[PDB]
């Protein structure tokens, strides 16, 4: 009984400048695991190379709040006031240095302006002042 949901990564921003930017992204696939955990799979096209990403999120006492990379990173995935959209905010250590990231997730790949503006406001309030990058969506990635 593999409980699941398909999402699109529609926008993203961060606190530390990471000019490395995807050209395209595949659907993000969420899968429920045993022990209450939640798996996310996505592929990113950068420089004609397909990067396959899998993250396991452990659920906490608090709803919408997950830990990742063995407790070293905290991820909040909370519903947006805008329909069929969620905001992901991840603070903590990635590869040794501190970084905070935000992602807009959506059911429709077609960009929603209402959702983007909320996502902007969220980002600006947390102090993620850098440019918000909208991502293009492609069903598959190959060299």
């Amino acid at each position, epitope marked *: *009984v593999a*409980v*699941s*949901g*398909k*999402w699109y990564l529609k926008a993203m921003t961060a606190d530390q400048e990471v000019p490395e930017k995807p050209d395209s992204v595949t659907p993000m696939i*969420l899968k*429920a695991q045993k022990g209450g955990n*939640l798996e996310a799979k996505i592929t990113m096209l950068t420089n004609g190379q397909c990067q396959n990403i899998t993250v396991v999120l452990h659920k906490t006492s608090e*709803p*919408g709040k997950y830990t990742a990379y063995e407790g070293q990173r905290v991820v909040f*995935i909370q*519903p*947006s*006031p805008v*329909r*069929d959209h*969620y905001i992901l905010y991840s603070e903590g250590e990635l590869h040794g240095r501190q970084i905070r990231m935000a992602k807009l*997730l959506g*059911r*429709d790949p077609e960009q929603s302006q209402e959702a983007l503006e909320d996502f902007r406001e969220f980002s600006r309030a947390k102090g993620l002042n850098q440019e918000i990058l909208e991502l293009a969506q492609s069903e598959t990635c190959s060299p």
Partner: antibody
Framework: QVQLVQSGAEVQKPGSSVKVSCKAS????????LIWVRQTPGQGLEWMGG????????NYAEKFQGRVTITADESTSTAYMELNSLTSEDTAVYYC???????????????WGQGTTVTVSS | EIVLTQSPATLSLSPGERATLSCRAS??????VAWYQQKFGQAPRLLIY???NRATGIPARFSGSGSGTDFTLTISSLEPEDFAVYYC??????????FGGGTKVQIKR
């Protein structure tokens, strides 16, 4: 875990008001949608309205807008549906339900009350 | 508000046959449809949620599919207790959470 326990059955006279209750034993409905559904005898399920915390608003179906009021008291962990100007056609079973919709993906562990029968007749 | 249309309204199938119920939406509802069963004079019972996911303890026979406007409940092989009314409903953090008129699965003779 969470359990929804409704007020008992009610026989109401045309023109009156009925307020059904919905006590959540365990958990809160501060993040989860709390909805009210009814079913006219031998007819289909009708969504009346609910509390939608993600938009920070209580919303009603157009069919019921203005006759119905949905409230919640966090101290008593209870929610209420008050139907006004009852007619014989408001004879039905009223349900309250808390929907497991907050997480981006969950196990679908919704919770329904046992239902409250309201019979409108003098 | 959004309207969910369940057609056909009655389905007459023999026990053991496959059943295919439809629930079309007036607008695009993105994987936010649930399916309920309701046996005569009983409370509604959740089968499927988020269009495709099955609730706890729900036999494998029951499967949901679809996205956008057109959704489907499939019962791989009807058992005797599966003859009942099935409803589809918008089930989401965002209103409205309207219901379908329902489809009644009945014994063919």
């Amino acid at each position: 875990q969470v359990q929804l326990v409704q007020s008992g059955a009610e026989v109401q006279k045309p023109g009156s008001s009925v307020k059904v209750s919905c006590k959540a034993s365990g958990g809160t409905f501060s993040r989860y949608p709390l909805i009210w559904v009814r079913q006219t005898p031998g007819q289909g399920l009708e969504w009346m309205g609910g509390i939608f915390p993600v938009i920070g608003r209580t919303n009603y179906a157009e069919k019921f807008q203005g006759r119905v009021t949905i409230t919640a008291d966090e101290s008593t962990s209870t929610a209420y549906m008050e139907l006004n100007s009852l007619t014989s056609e408001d004879t039905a079973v009223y349900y309250c339900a808390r929907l497991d919709t907050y997480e981006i993906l969950g196990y679908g562990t919704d919770v329904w009350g046992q239902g409250t029968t309201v019979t409108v007749s003098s | 508000e959004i309207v969910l249309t369940q057609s056909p309204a009655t389905l007459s199938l023999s026990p053991g046959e496959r059943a295919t119920l439809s629930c079309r939406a007036s607008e695009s509802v993105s994987s936010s449809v649930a399916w309920y069963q309701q046996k005569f004079g009983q409370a509604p019972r959740l089968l499927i949620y988020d269009a495709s996911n099955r609730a706890t303890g729900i036999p494998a026979r029951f499967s949901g599919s679809g996205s956008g406007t057109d959704f489907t409940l499939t019962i791989s092989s009807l058992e005797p207790e599966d003859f009942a009314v099935y409803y589809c409903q918008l089930r989401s953090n965002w209103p409205p959470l309207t219901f379908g008129g329902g489809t009644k699965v009945q014994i063919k003779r």
